[PDB]
Amino acid sequence: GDCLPHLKRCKADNDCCGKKCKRRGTNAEKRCR
C-alpha cells in the first residue's frame, strides 16, 4: 500500500497520494497532477 507523489507517473487514477493522477483524456494513468 503506497500512493505516488503529486508529480510522478501513475499507473492508475487512485495511485497518487492526491488521488488525482493525470492522463491523456479522462483519468487513466499519465502523471500525478
Curated annotation (Swiss-Prot):
Keyword Membrane: yes or no? no
Q: Supply the alphabetized keyword list.
A: Calcium channel impairing toxin, Disulfide bond, Ion channel impairing toxin, Knottin, Neurotoxin, Ryanodine-sensitive calcium-release channel impairing toxin, Secreted, Toxin
Q: What segment(s) does the record annotate as region Essential for stimulation of [3H]ryanodine binding to RYR1?
A: 22-24
Q: Where in the cell is it found?
A: Secreted
Q: What is the effect of changing N27A?
A: 20.09-fold decrease of stimulation of [3H]ryanodine binding to RYR1
Return the GO cellular component terms, semicolon-separated.
extracellular region
Top-level taxonomic group: Eukaryota
Mutagenesis / variant outcome for changing G25A: 23.96-fold decrease of stimulation of [3H]ryanodine binding to RYR1
Site (described: Important for stimulation of [3H]ryanodine binding to RYR1): H6, K11, K30
Q: In which tissues is it expressed?
A: Expressed by the venom gland.
Give the protein's function: This toxin affects the activity of ryanodine receptors 1, 2 and 3 (RyR1, RyR2 and RyR3). At lower concentrations the toxin increases full openings of the RyRs, and at higher concentrations it inhibits full openings and induces openings to subconductance levels (30% of the full conductance state) and reduces the number of full conductance openings.
Result of changing H6A: 20.72-fold decrease of stimulation of [3H]ryanodine binding to RYR1
Q: Which family does it belong to?
A: Belongs to the scorpion calcin family.
One MF term in GO for this entry?
A: calcium channel inhibitor activity
| Recorded consequence of changing C17A | Linear IpCa; Loss of stimulation of [3H]ryanodine binding to RYR1
What are the start and end residues of every segment in region (Important for stimulation of [3H]ryanodine binding to RYR1)?
8-9, 19-20, 25-27
Q: Which Pfam families does the entry link to?
A: Toxin_27 (PF08099)
Q: Where is this site: Essential for stimulation of [3H]ryanodine binding to RYR1?
A: L7, R31, R33
Spell out the disulfide connections: C3-C17, C10-C21, C16-C32
**InterPro entries listed in its UniProt record:** Scorpion_calcine
Q: Give the comment on domains.
A: The presence of a 'disulfide through disulfide knot' structurally defines this protein as a knottin.
Species per Swiss-Prot/TrEMBL record: Pandinus imperator (Emperor scorpion)
Q: What is the effect of changing P5A?
A: 1.43-fold decrease of stimulation of [3H]ryanodine binding to RYR1
Report the protein name in the record: Imperacalcin
Q: Has keyword Disulfide bond?
A: yes
Q: How the protein is affected by changing R23A?
A: 418.48-fold decrease of stimulation of [3H]ryanodine binding to RYR1
